[PDB]
Amino acid sequence: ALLRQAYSALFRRTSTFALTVVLGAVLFERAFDQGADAIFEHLNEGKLWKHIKHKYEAS
Amino acid sequence: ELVDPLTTIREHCEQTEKCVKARERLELCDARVSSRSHTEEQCTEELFDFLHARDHCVAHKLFNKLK
Amino acid sequence: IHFGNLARVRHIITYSLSPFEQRAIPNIFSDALPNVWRRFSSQVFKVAPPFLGAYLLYSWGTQEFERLKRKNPADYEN
Amino acid sequence: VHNDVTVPDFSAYRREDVMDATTSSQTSSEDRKGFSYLVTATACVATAY
Amino acid sequence: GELELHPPAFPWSHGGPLSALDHSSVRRGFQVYKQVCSACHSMDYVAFRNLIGVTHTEAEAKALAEEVEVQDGPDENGELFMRPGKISDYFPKPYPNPEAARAANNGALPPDLSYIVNARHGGEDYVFSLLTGYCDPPAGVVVREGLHYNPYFPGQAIGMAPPIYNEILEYDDGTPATMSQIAKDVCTFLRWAAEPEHDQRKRMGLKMLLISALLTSLLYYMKRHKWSVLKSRKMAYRPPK
Amino acid sequence: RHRTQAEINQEAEVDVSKLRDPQHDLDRVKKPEWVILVGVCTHLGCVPI
Amino acid sequence: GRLMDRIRKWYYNAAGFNKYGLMRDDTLYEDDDVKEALKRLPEDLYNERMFRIKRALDLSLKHRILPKEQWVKYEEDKPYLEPYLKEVIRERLEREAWNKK
Amino acid sequence: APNIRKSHPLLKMINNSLIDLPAPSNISAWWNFGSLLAVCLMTQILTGLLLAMHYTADTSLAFSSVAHTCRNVQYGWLIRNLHANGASFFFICIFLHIGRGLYYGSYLYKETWNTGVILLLTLMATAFVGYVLPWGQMSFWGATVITNLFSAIPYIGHTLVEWAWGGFSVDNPTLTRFFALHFLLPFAIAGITIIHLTFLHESGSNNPLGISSDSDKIPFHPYYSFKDILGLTLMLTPFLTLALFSPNLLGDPENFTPANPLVTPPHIKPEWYFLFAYAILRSIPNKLGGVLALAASVLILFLIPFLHKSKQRTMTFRPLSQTLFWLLVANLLILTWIGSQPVEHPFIIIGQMASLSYFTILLILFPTIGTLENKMLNY
Amino acid sequence: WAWGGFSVDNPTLTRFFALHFLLPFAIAGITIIHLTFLHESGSNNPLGISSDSDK
Amino acid sequence: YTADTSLAFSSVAHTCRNVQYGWLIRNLHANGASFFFICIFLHIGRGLYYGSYL
Ligand code: HEC
Ligand code: HEM
């Protein structure tokens, strides 16, 4: 009954619906960025400065 | 010593039918143009047909051997 | 402000359901796609033709231009 | 006369849970709305992002 | 007359829509620019700081900059003086003005290379083909003195003598310095020099595609949802009769 | 431009009455081997090669 | 020879307004002359035209057409407005001619 | 009044144009480009301001200030891509908007149409002066070709050109004034858009069937607000895909080279959205004649409403016109293609053909076929 | 942020020009709103009493 | 005008010194700003005095 539970607690009152969108965005962003960055770096393993750096890092 | 894969591959590609035929037509042009003393002709076209076929071939293999 | 003075209408009944009582994209296979095909079909021989022709004129004109760049062996025979 | 008027049949369109005329439609209302609003709330999140 | 040979398409590791640049290759390419091309080619739009976190570390970048002497001033006497480079400095110009440049290249002007791959049809494919494609003129074609035959250059007679050959330098990373290897690297470097944002642009594009797929779907539903009212709507004409 | 003596002749040989801008090659110069012009195409302004 | 009938029947079918249940007259652009004529139509003919049009717009929005059995047939198409419209234009021309006179 | 949405003098306006506005129930995707054009306008202005805040209108600094923007300004490169490509998106949408208009006879709304043409003309001038700003080789020479078009006008021609230039050739005063014009014009476009929509509301929208929709209207919200937002995201994908994965697909590499007054590029070719017109300009081997053909190629749009002979508004039920319509569209593709090629056989002849047929379809075939179709309906 | 740097400098100048170019038009637009609200009632007058009897 | 610290001051000078009537246009703009404030102040004054603010 998630759809049902979600409706009552989150989607019914316009106020709660707004808070749900705010937190939802906050959560979504954190996850979407990380996943997106991961997918990108994975498709480019060994080509980024992130990958090469260790060779010349010598601080 | 040291060998540029570009040389290797270019020689291999020149063995190709298309290159061989193009090469052939070029040598023929070169020969006749070089033998005359009053002709406007030039062998750019045949050279291009050749270079075009050879290099197209090179493109596919060359980077496989480069770092 | 136009609603209310648009047209003189009589004896027409209409029935509708809340958007929550129905499906958003119903009968995709039994109705949607069959109609997309209908629509496509009824227009392809109206649209496609001139574009096909444009494509040809393009192919020709392009090939002809490049053909005229080639050497004419009959210019150096003698 | 209006007595001879009846609402057509919308079975080719009704959501599965309100297809049966002898079942309360209220029991599936929250789900039917929860879902539609979920889409909307999600679109709002993607948009805010 | 207008006979031209167009370069083939090489499978650069940065050609794919989600393909970043090979930074090892960009680092090397830089050395080629620094040790070979910069002798006659300027790169006005890139500074030593641009290297940091891309191809070099900050320490390295600073070193590279200090290797150069730059003019500054005026000082207290209103005199111009020399000083060692700072990472905020842009790459040194080989000449004070194009006049001097031409003067040192037989009237020919070596172009700035900051945007060269974008200023030429074919981009790196063209720069690569030109660098490795020198050869003797075909029968019936004579190159005037000072120029060199290159089928890839328009007109085919370029004022640039073949800039690179095997082992013309030594990659400090041990990569076999072959002519084509060198061209391939410097070309990669040139791509970066022209669009430093290359990588970030592609990472954004990825997200753009995902968010777009998602959002387009949700909006499609919502439009369908609201319009269902009219789409399934029925009507009849019941005149009194 | 410095015109060879060969050139200066071919310009003396031009049907003027059959030209767009009816002008004799000696109405444009003060010294035959020296022709000075403003290299801008009188059409839409490009520079003539 | 009956060449028109051949052509006019082909066109009618090619046009396709009959797929929406519309008569030829239902599709006329409502300029001044047409607007006037419409006001002269008898109640029923008017209400009928309205339903056909509303119905067609509903079809147009739905992106459907009527089942082939409901398409109007070339020879059953009713030129319900043409007579009115002609009178309307005639009258107009009369006024026009007269106002120059 | 009981509810503010109607009494308030400002909301009243929003309500009557975007909430309670009566809209035909059956308008298609072809009616989505009006709002898309509006969004391009808002988008272009917003990105233009952001770019203008780092731009420098001076021949010695133009090119590099743009370079400075793309290389140093946070997301400067992104903002520039969005602006440059947005201009294309703007033309794609304006052309489809126009097509829809001609097809559905939306031009029978004469004032909405006419201002529509003014909007097009203004957008063209905007794009032109804007394109010149980066000051590359293409910016410079295009500016040279275009401005010299006006020199074709008899008597006052040379005088007008030198005036517009602020000197004897395209130079710094041309650049600085072009920047100002480029900054100003977009706002005239915004203003005239209001006039456009004002005339339009006098009658509300037309619809695909070309028959009165008074019997079936619906509130703009949420029907078309939702449909419009959907259309926005659909067109937004290609736009972003292009801008983010192929930033330079549409531009001439020649514009990555600082303008050189002494060297004209070998193949001067205009942006894609001007090709078909360029083609027409070249069809007539006579300076003035070619200019008139070009002028007429666009001003011909003011004539459309008077070449309507059909007794029906749209082409929906006019199969012969529909063919004639797609011929015209294809004719435009051919012109576009011809405009990107050099002036040489077979292009020259193909070009003059397409040019000649372009005007023939609009000035003769369309009114003629419309009359012919009327008779086949027995009218 | 407003400065675009650590002090009033070139990026301040170029952004100020753009603002200066833009704002006058916001002034023009808001003027329309000004006169729009005004016409809801028309002008007031020196005696501060209704002038409906003498317009 | 030219918005760049190295050219601002002189572009204005160029305007007043070289542009036909440039000096006049600059005076009208500079002084117009003042007339603008004189008028806005009196407009406000009138407003406060006559209760236009209601
Ligand atoms: C001795 C000076 C010199 C060196 C070293 C040199 N160049 Fe050049 N380069 C030139 C000159 C001179 C031209 C001008 C050619 C012309 O226009 O005739 C030129 C032109 C070019 C062009 C293309 C010009 C065009 O019109 O397409 C490119 C690209 C280029 N060089 C790349 C390189 C790269 C990369 C390197 C280093 C690997 C390099 N050059 C090294 C002298 C040099
Ligand atoms: C800056 C450019 C323009 C903008 C922002 C714009 C905007 C709009 C808007 C929002 C609409 C309503 C929705 C729609 O039907 O698309 C519209 C309708 C219309 N516009 Fe434009 N327009 C522009 C250019 C033009 C052009 C170039 C023409 C004609 C040459 C034109 C002709 C019309 C007409 C006739 C309609 C009527 C639509 C109908 O048939 O109902 N518009 N426009």
Ligand code: HEM
């Ligand atoms: C109708 C909307 C607009 C259109 C069609 C448009 C179009 C263009 C075009 C064609 C370019 C050249 C892009 C390139 O570099 O290749 C350009 C440049 C520019 N535009 Fe706009 N523009 C619009 C609105 C604006 C506005 C409102 C401003 C500023 C307030 C503006 C400021 C600029 C600036 C500063 C540039 C130079 C930087 C650059 O070239 O990227 N534009 N514009």
Ligand code: HEM
């Ligand atoms: C760009 C600035 C402004 C412009 C162009 C402007 C323009 C106008 C116009 C044309 C009128 C009608 C004629 C008149 O009574 O003077 C008016 C009236 C008025 N304005 Fe402004 N105004 C401006 C600024 C202001 C300011 C700063 C205030 C108040 C802080 C203001 C308050 C009013 C009011 C209340 C009236 C009512 C006059 C009456 O008592 O009948 N205006 N304004």
Ligand SMILES: C[C@@]1(c2ccc(Oc3ccccc3)cc2)OC(=O)N(Nc2ccccc2)C1=O
């Ligand atoms: C973007 C562009 C452009 C935009 C709109 C145009 O439409 C016109 C605007 C004003 C006057 C005439 C046409 C023309 C060119 O501006 C510009 O310099 N170019 N480039 C160009 C190149 C060669 C010849 C002619 C032009 C454009 O395409």
Ligand SMILES: CCCCCCCCO[C@@H]1O[C@H](CO)[C@@H](O)[C@H](O)[C@H]1O
């Ligand atoms: C005080 C807060 C400081 C935050 C520093 C912001 C640094 C922005 O870092 C950004 O990260 C992106 C993802 O890796 C890269 O693609 C961008 O090029 C880079 O500039």
Ligand SMILES: CCCCCCCCO[C@@H]1O[C@H](CO)[C@@H](O)[C@H](O)[C@H]1O
């Ligand atoms: C409908 C299209 C929505 C576009 C949303 C994509 C958001 C772009 O995301 C961007 O990615 C960059 C690369 O990691 C980051 O450096 C930026 O800070 C971030 O905003």
Ligand code: FES
């Ligand atoms: S041929 Fe047209 S500008 Fe020279």
